[PDB]
Amino acid sequence: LPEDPKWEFPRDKLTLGKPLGEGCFGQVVMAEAVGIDKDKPKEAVTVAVKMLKDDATEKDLSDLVSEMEMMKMIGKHKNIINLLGACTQDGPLYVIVEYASKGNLREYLRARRPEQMTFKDLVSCTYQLARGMEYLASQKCIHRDLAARNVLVTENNVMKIADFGLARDINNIDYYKKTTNGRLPVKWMAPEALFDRVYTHQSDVWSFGVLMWEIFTLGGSPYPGIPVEELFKLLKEGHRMDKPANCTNELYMMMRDCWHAVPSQRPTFKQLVEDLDRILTLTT
Ligand SMILES: C=CC(=O)Nc1ccc(-c2c(-c3ccc(OC)cc3)c3c(N)ncnc3n2C)cc1
Ligand SMILES: N[C@@H](CCC(=O)N[C@@H](CS)C(=O)NCC(=O)O)C(=O)O
């Protein structure tokens, strides 16, 4: 692993704590980092640390390195989980990231189902994530794994995109290759990502529409009752999810535009941000 002093953090100033989540690419633990904020070199900050599991594979390590590099290239934004540092030399690979105390968005929403959530809160949540994707797209980055489970909520109820393990630069896609997009969850995936084996920002817009549906169902599971094996046939025939109850007609029409069959006819993240900003302002 090449040295990157800009992002390197000393191992002796990092103390691992309770585990936060345990998936399949790795594990995440809460930790205390002393001096991670360079202006406060003696203060210990609570952070999250992603590392490999004991049964990790070679691909797991390459995915973790790719995720680290992508978060280095992306840059800083209010609605993106902030990379804080990395332990990469002489020991296990640790990726140190900002700690979001309220967990992922799906559980956050499902827990606040009848501090209950209002319509304004859901619109504000959607606007924040639209902004986050607009910034990502401006950096020529495609997320490819947009979903409520991959959004984190901070103590101040700020929404952060996270889990960049599948994210790629817009030009770093093997177009029309049979293996391309094979590790994307099918119920959040744009049809062309599987029918044509391409991925653009308009594919992310589709996923964002699915994310919107998750948000206004307060954490519902997309395409309820429809197994993955039958979904894509129905999508080819024009099936789309019905309007959630807590949604306005205008927001559902926005979801359906995100789900246009023709990618170029879907809205861009900039248009989504403008429309959501108008809607959120009117709600005041
Ligand atoms: C199965 C695939 C998979 O990775 N799942 C998964 C997704 C998220 C989390 C996760 C994080 C988190 C997210 C991205 C990171 O990037 C290096 C680091 C930590 C986090 C956090 N920073 N603060 C509070 N809670 C958090 N959680 C729960 C754990 C497992
Ligand atoms: N691409 C090389 C290096 C990437 C890497 O870090 N691989 C891990 C597998 S867990 C390793 O220990 N490789 C042995 C080495 O560093 O030469 C490889 O996979 O062998």
Side-chain angles (χ1 to χ4, degrees):
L1 273 176
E3 283 140 272
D4 199 345
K6 178 195 173 353
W7 291 104
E8 192 73 18
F9 188 76
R11 295 178 178 283
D12 66 45
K13 281 198 289 133
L14 187 71
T15 294
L16 310 173
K18 64 198 64 73
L20 294 185
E22 159 180 76
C24 55
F25 290 11
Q27 57 174 147
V28 175
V29 308
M30 179 180 324
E32 310 263 284
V34 162
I36 195 84
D37 177 7
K38 272 37 163 195
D39 280 350
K40 281 166 145 73
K42 302 285 182 343
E43 216 143 344
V45 186
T46 305
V47 304
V49 186
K50 208 197 198 248
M51 57 185 92
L52 294 181
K53 298 155 66 170
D54 218 41
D55 65 345
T57 77
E58 188 198 61
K59 197 46 172 213
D60 287 332
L61 177 61
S62 80
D63 285 358
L64 188 55
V65 173
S66 170
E67 189 171 353
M68 204 192 33
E69 293 304 293
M70 187 61 52
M71 300 177 78
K72 284 182 192 175
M73 140 180 174
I74 271 172
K76 197 190 226 253
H77 184 257
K78 211 245 181 163
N79 293 121
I80 295 179
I81 202 73
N82 190 31
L83 176 71
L84 299 186
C87 309
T88 77
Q89 303 302 323
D90 265 352
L93 171 60
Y94 297 156
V95 182
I96 313 168
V97 154
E98 150 178 44
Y99 171 67
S101 64
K102 302 210 175 182
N104 80 55
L105 182 56
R106 174 153 110 173
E107 309 299 28
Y108 174 97
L109 286 172
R110 277 191 191 150
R112 286 153 185 69
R113 287 179 160 188
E115 36 189 272
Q116 178 160 345
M117 295 269 303
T118 71
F119 175 79
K120 162 144 280 212
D121 292 336
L122 305 167
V123 173
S124 173
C125 176
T126 309
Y127 170 74
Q128 290 177 68
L129 292 156
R131 270 209 317 181
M133 293 299 312
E134 189 204 27
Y135 174 67
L136 283 182
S138 86
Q139 304 298 107
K140 302 178 209 121
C141 166
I142 34 172
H143 192 271
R144 289 165 94 214
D145 201 12
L146 246 186
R149 87 201 101 91
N150 289 345
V151 178
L152 295 165
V153 190
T154 74
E155 193 51 16
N156 302 316
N157 298 301
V158 179
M159 310 276 130
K160 308 272 193 174
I161 299 159
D163 295 339
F164 289 90
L166 291 160
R168 303 275 180 274
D169 176 84
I170 186 65
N171 275 302
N172 183 21
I173 294 276
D174 205 13
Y175 329 90
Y176 312 127
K177 189 79 161 120
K178 47 174 289 263
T179 63
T180 300
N181 299 323
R183 299 157 65 213
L184 310 186
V186 165
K187 287 195 171 192
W188 284 258
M189 197 180 12
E192 69 273 8
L194 201 89
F195 297 147
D196 300 327
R197 307 287 176 174
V198 302
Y199 205 101
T200 74
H201 299 297
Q202 303 309 100
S203 314
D204 269 345
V205 167
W206 179 290
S207 303
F208 180 87
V210 180
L211 173 59
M212 277 172 73
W213 191 93
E214 284 182 287
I215 288 166
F216 284 96
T217 59
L218 280 311
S221 308
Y223 309 101
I226 300 173
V228 178
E229 297 95 326
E230 305 165 353
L231 176 55
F232 261 71
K233 171 99 156 293
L234 293 171
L235 287 176
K236 176 174 127 143
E237 288 163 8
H239 170 81
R240 301 287 187 269
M241 278 187 293
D242 288 324
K243 175 179 112 71
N246 312 130
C247 199
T248 64
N249 297 337
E250 171 176 35
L251 285 164
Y252 180 59
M253 281 165 69
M254 168 164 340
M255 288 179 212
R256 297 289 304 259
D257 288 340
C258 291
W259 299 332
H260 201 92
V262 188
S264 70
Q265 276 312 297
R266 299 171 197 151
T268 67
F269 284 119
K270 176 176 164 112
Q271 316 177 296
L272 289 172
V273 164
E274 292 158 353
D275 291 332
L276 291 160
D277 189 10
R278 170 185 48 80
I279 294 170
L280 182 66
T281 299
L282 200 133
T283 315
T284 285

Coordinates of all heavy atoms in Angstrom, one line a residue, residues 90-129:
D90 N 1.9 -1.0 8.1 CA 2.4 -1.8 9.2 C 1.2 -2.2 10.1 O 1.3 -1.9 11.3 CB 3.5 -1.2 9.9 CG 4.9 -1.6 9.4 OD1 5.0 -2.5 8.6 OD2 5.9 -1.0 9.9
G91 N 0.2 -2.9 9.5 CA -0.9 -3.4 10.3 C -2.1 -3.6 9.5 O -2.2 -3.3 8.3
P92 N -3.2 -4.0 10.2 CA -4.5 -4.1 9.5 C -4.9 -2.7 8.9 O -4.6 -1.7 9.4 CB -5.5 -4.6 10.6 CG -4.8 -4.2 11.9 CD -3.3 -4.2 11.6
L93 N -5.7 -2.8 7.8 CA -6.2 -1.6 7.2 C -7.5 -1.1 8.0 O -8.5 -1.8 8.1 CB -6.6 -1.9 5.7 CG -7.3 -0.7 5.0 CD1 -6.5 0.5 5.0 CD2 -7.6 -1.2 3.6
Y94 N -7.4 0.1 8.5 CA -8.5 0.8 9.1 C -8.9 2.0 8.3 O -8.0 2.8 7.9 CB -8.1 1.3 10.5 CG -7.8 0.1 11.5 CD1 -7.0 0.4 12.6 CD2 -8.3 -1.2 11.3 CE1 -6.7 -0.6 13.5 CE2 -8.0 -2.2 12.2 CZ -7.2 -1.9 13.3 OH -7.0 -2.9 14.2
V95 N -10.2 2.2 8.0 CA -10.7 3.4 7.4 C -11.5 4.1 8.4 O -12.6 3.6 8.8 CB -11.5 3.1 6.1 CG1 -12.0 4.3 5.5 CG2 -10.7 2.2 5.2
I96 N -11.1 5.3 8.8 CA -11.7 6.1 9.9 C -12.6 7.1 9.3 O -12.2 7.8 8.4 CB -10.6 6.7 10.8 CG1 -9.5 5.7 11.2 CG2 -11.3 7.2 12.1 CD1 -8.3 6.4 11.8
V97 N -13.8 7.1 9.8 CA -14.9 7.9 9.2 C -15.7 8.6 10.3 O -15.8 8.1 11.5 CB -15.8 7.0 8.3 CG1 -17.2 7.5 8.2 CG2 -15.2 6.8 7.0
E98 N -16.4 9.7 10.0 CA -17.2 10.4 10.9 C -18.3 9.5 11.5 O -18.8 8.6 10.8 CB -17.8 11.6 10.2 CG -19.2 12.1 10.6 CD -19.6 13.3 9.8 OE1 -19.4 13.3 8.5 OE2 -20.1 14.3 10.4
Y99 N -18.6 9.7 12.7 CA -19.6 8.8 13.5 C -20.9 9.5 13.4 O -21.1 10.6 13.8 CB -19.1 8.6 14.9 CG -20.1 7.9 15.8 CD1 -20.5 6.6 15.6 CD2 -20.7 8.6 16.9 CE1 -21.4 6.0 16.4 CE2 -21.6 8.0 17.7 CZ -22.0 6.7 17.5 OH -22.9 6.1 18.3
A100 N -21.9 8.7 12.9 CA -23.3 9.2 12.9 C -24.1 8.4 13.9 O -24.3 7.2 13.8 CB -23.9 8.9 11.5
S101 N -24.5 9.1 15.0 CA -25.0 8.4 16.2 C -26.4 7.8 16.1 O -26.8 7.0 16.9 CB -25.0 9.4 17.4 OG -25.9 10.5 17.1
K102 N -27.1 8.2 15.0 CA -28.5 7.7 14.9 C -28.7 6.6 13.9 O -29.8 6.2 13.7 CB -29.4 8.9 14.5 CG -29.4 10.0 15.5 CD -30.7 10.8 15.6 CE -30.7 11.9 16.6 NZ -32.0 12.6 16.7
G103 N -27.6 6.0 13.4 CA -27.7 4.8 12.6 C -28.1 5.1 11.2 O -28.1 6.2 10.7
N104 N -28.5 4.0 10.5 CA -28.9 4.1 9.1 C -30.3 4.6 9.0 O -31.1 4.4 9.9 CB -28.6 2.8 8.4 CG -29.8 1.8 8.6 OD1 -30.9 2.0 8.3 ND2 -29.4 0.6 9.0
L105 N -30.6 5.1 7.8 CA -31.9 5.8 7.7 C -33.1 4.9 7.8 O -34.1 5.3 8.3 CB -31.9 6.6 6.3 CG -33.1 7.4 6.0 CD1 -33.4 8.4 7.1 CD2 -32.9 8.1 4.6
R106 N -32.9 3.7 7.2 CA -34.1 2.8 7.3 C -34.5 2.5 8.7 O -35.7 2.5 9.0 CB -33.7 1.5 6.5 CG -34.9 0.4 6.6 CD -34.9 -0.5 5.4 NE -34.4 -1.8 5.8 CZ -34.5 -2.9 5.0 NH1 -35.0 -2.8 3.8 NH2 -34.1 -4.1 5.5
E107 N -33.6 2.1 9.6 CA -33.9 1.9 11.0 C -34.4 3.1 11.7 O -35.4 3.1 12.4 CB -32.7 1.3 11.7 CG -32.1 0.1 11.0 CD -33.0 -1.1 10.8 OE1 -34.2 -1.0 10.7 OE2 -32.5 -2.3 10.8
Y108 N -33.8 4.3 11.4 CA -34.2 5.5 11.9 C -35.7 5.8 11.6 O -36.5 6.1 12.5 CB -33.3 6.6 11.4 CG -33.7 8.1 11.7 CD1 -33.1 8.7 12.8 CD2 -34.6 8.8 10.9 CE1 -33.4 10.0 13.0 CE2 -34.9 10.1 11.2 CZ -34.3 10.7 12.3 OH -34.7 12.0 12.5
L109 N -36.0 5.6 10.3 CA -37.4 5.8 9.9 C -38.4 4.8 10.5 O -39.4 5.2 11.0 CB -37.5 5.8 8.4 CG -36.9 7.1 7.7 CD1 -36.9 6.9 6.2 CD2 -37.7 8.3 8.0
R110 N -38.0 3.5 10.4 CA -38.9 2.5 10.9 C -39.1 2.6 12.4 O -40.2 2.3 12.9 CB -38.3 1.1 10.6 CG -38.6 0.6 9.3 CD -38.2 -0.9 9.1 NE -38.3 -1.3 7.7 CZ -37.6 -2.3 7.2 NH1 -36.7 -3.0 7.9 NH2 -37.7 -2.6 5.9
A111 N -38.1 3.2 13.2 CA -38.3 3.4 14.6 C -39.2 4.5 14.9 O -39.9 4.5 15.9 CB -36.9 3.6 15.3
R112 N -39.2 5.6 14.1 CA -40.1 6.7 14.3 C -41.4 6.6 13.6 O -42.1 7.6 13.3 CB -39.4 8.0 13.8 CG -38.2 8.5 14.7 CD -37.2 9.2 14.0 NE -36.0 9.6 14.8 CZ -35.2 8.7 15.3 NH1 -35.3 7.4 15.0 NH2 -34.2 9.1 16.2
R113 N -41.9 5.3 13.3 CA -43.2 5.1 12.8 C -44.2 5.2 13.9 O -44.0 4.7 15.0 CB -43.3 3.7 12.2 CG -42.6 3.5 10.8 CD -42.7 2.1 10.4 NE -42.5 1.9 8.9 CZ -42.7 0.8 8.2 NH1 -43.2 -0.3 8.8 NH2 -42.5 0.8 6.9
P114 N -45.4 5.7 13.6 CA -46.6 5.5 14.5 C -46.7 4.1 14.9 O -46.4 3.2 14.1 CB -47.7 6.0 13.7 CG -47.2 7.0 12.7 CD -45.6 6.8 12.7
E115 N -39.9 10.0 18.7 CA -39.9 11.3 18.0 C -40.5 11.2 16.6 O -39.7 11.2 15.6 CB -38.5 11.9 18.0 CG -37.4 11.0 17.9 CD -36.0 11.6 18.1 OE1 -35.4 12.2 17.1 OE2 -35.5 11.6 19.2
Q116 N -41.8 11.0 16.5 CA -42.4 10.7 15.2 C -42.1 11.7 14.0 O -42.0 12.9 14.3 CB -44.0 10.9 15.3 CG -44.8 10.7 14.1 CD -46.2 10.3 14.4 OE1 -46.6 9.9 15.5 NE2 -47.1 10.4 13.3
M117 N -42.0 11.2 12.8 CA -41.6 12.0 11.7 C -42.8 12.7 11.0 O -43.9 12.1 10.8 CB -40.9 11.1 10.7 CG -39.6 10.6 11.1 SD -38.2 11.6 10.7 CE -38.3 11.7 8.9
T118 N -42.6 13.9 10.6 CA -43.6 14.7 9.9 C -43.3 14.8 8.4 O -42.2 14.4 7.9 CB -43.7 16.2 10.4 OG1 -42.5 16.9 10.0 CG2 -43.8 16.2 11.9
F119 N -44.2 15.3 7.6 CA -44.0 15.4 6.2 C -42.9 16.3 5.8 O -42.1 16.0 5.0 CB -45.3 15.9 5.5 CG -45.2 16.2 4.0 CD1 -45.2 15.1 3.1 CD2 -45.0 17.5 3.6 CE1 -45.1 15.4 1.8 CE2 -44.9 17.7 2.2 CZ -45.0 16.7 1.3
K120 N -42.8 17.4 6.5 CA -41.6 18.3 6.3 C -40.3 17.6 6.6 O -39.3 17.7 5.8 CB -41.7 19.5 7.3 CG -40.4 20.3 7.5 CD -40.7 21.8 7.6 CE -40.9 22.4 6.2 NZ -40.4 23.9 6.2
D121 N -40.2 16.8 7.6 CA -39.0 16.0 7.9 C -38.6 15.1 6.7 O -37.4 15.0 6.4 CB -39.1 15.2 9.2 CG -39.2 16.1 10.4 OD1 -38.8 17.3 10.4 OD2 -39.8 15.6 11.5
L122 N -39.6 14.5 6.1 CA -39.3 13.6 5.0 C -38.9 14.3 3.8 O -38.0 13.9 3.1 CB -40.6 12.7 4.7 CG -41.1 11.9 5.9 CD1 -42.5 11.4 5.5 CD2 -40.2 10.8 6.3
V123 N -39.5 15.5 3.6 CA -39.1 16.3 2.4 C -37.7 16.9 2.7 O -36.8 16.9 1.8 CB -40.1 17.5 2.2 CG1 -39.5 18.4 1.1 CG2 -41.4 16.9 1.8
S124 N -37.4 17.3 3.9 CA -36.0 17.8 4.3 C -35.0 16.7 4.1 O -33.9 16.9 3.6 CB -36.0 18.3 5.7 OG -34.7 18.6 6.1
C125 N -35.3 15.4 4.5 CA -34.5 14.3 4.3 C -34.2 14.1 2.8 O -33.0 13.9 2.4 CB -35.1 13.0 4.9 SG -34.2 11.5 4.7
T126 N -35.2 14.1 2.0 CA -35.0 13.9 0.6 C -34.2 15.0 -0.1 O -33.3 14.7 -0.9 CB -36.4 13.8 -0.1 OG1 -37.2 12.9 0.6 CG2 -36.3 13.4 -1.6
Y127 N -34.4 16.2 0.3 CA -33.7 17.4 -0.2 C -32.2 17.2 0.1 O -31.3 17.4 -0.8 CB -34.2 18.7 0.3 CG -33.4 19.9 0.0 CD1 -33.3 20.4 -1.3 CD2 -32.7 20.5 1.0 CE1 -32.6 21.6 -1.6 CE2 -31.9 21.7 0.7 CZ -31.9 22.2 -0.6 OH -31.1 23.3 -0.8
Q128 N -31.8 16.9 1.3 CA -30.5 16.7 1.7 C -29.8 15.7 0.9 O -28.6 15.9 0.4 CB -30.4 16.3 3.2 CG -30.8 17.4 4.2 CD -30.7 17.0 5.6 OE1 -29.6 16.7 6.2 NE2 -31.9 16.9 6.2
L129 N -30.4 14.5 0.7 CA -29.8 13.4 -0.1 C -29.7 13.8 -1.6 O -28.7 13.4 -2.3 CB -30.6 12.2 0.1 CG -30.5 11.6 1.5 CD1 -31.7 10.7 1.9 CD2 -29.2 10.8 1.7

